[PDB]
C-alpha cells in the first residue's frame, strides 16, 4: 500500500499548479509567449523537482 | 520578449539579451518638411524572424 500511495502522490502532483497558470506545460507554452512562459515553467519545474 | 511589427519583422532581440538600448530623438536633424522617405521598415514577412 505505501508504495502505491507514494506513486499515486507522485503522479497526482503532476496535476498541481504550484502557482502557475496550468498544470499542462503545452497549454502554458501555447497561450503565453516564451519570456513569460519561462517563469511558469520554472515554477512547475521547482514544484515537480 | 516584446511582440509587435518591428520586433518580429525588422530586428528581434533575444529573450536573454544582455546589452544596453540607447534612444534619443532625431527630429531636429532627420526630419524634412517634404517627407524623408529614405527610412523604411518591413511590414509583411512569411514568418517571424
Curated annotation (Swiss-Prot), chain A:
Domain of life of the organism encoding this protein: Viruses
Q: Which residues form a coiled coil?
A: 1-41
Q: What's its job?
A: Subunit of the fusion protein that is processed upon entry into the host cell. Mediates fusion of the virion and cellular membranes by functioning as a class I viral fusion protein. Contains a viral fusion peptide that is unmasked after S2 cleavage. This cleavage can occur at the cell membrane by host TMPRSS2 or during endocytosis by host CSTL. In either case, this triggers an extensive and irreversible conformational change that leads to fusion of the viral envelope with the cellular cytoplasmic membrane, releasing viral genomic RNA into the host cell cytoplasm.
User: By what name is this protein known?
Assistant: Spike protein S2'
Native source species: Severe acute respiratory syndrome coronavirus 2 (2019-nCoV)
* Gene that this polypeptide is encoded by: S
Indicate the span of the full protein covered. Answer: 953 to 1001 of 1273
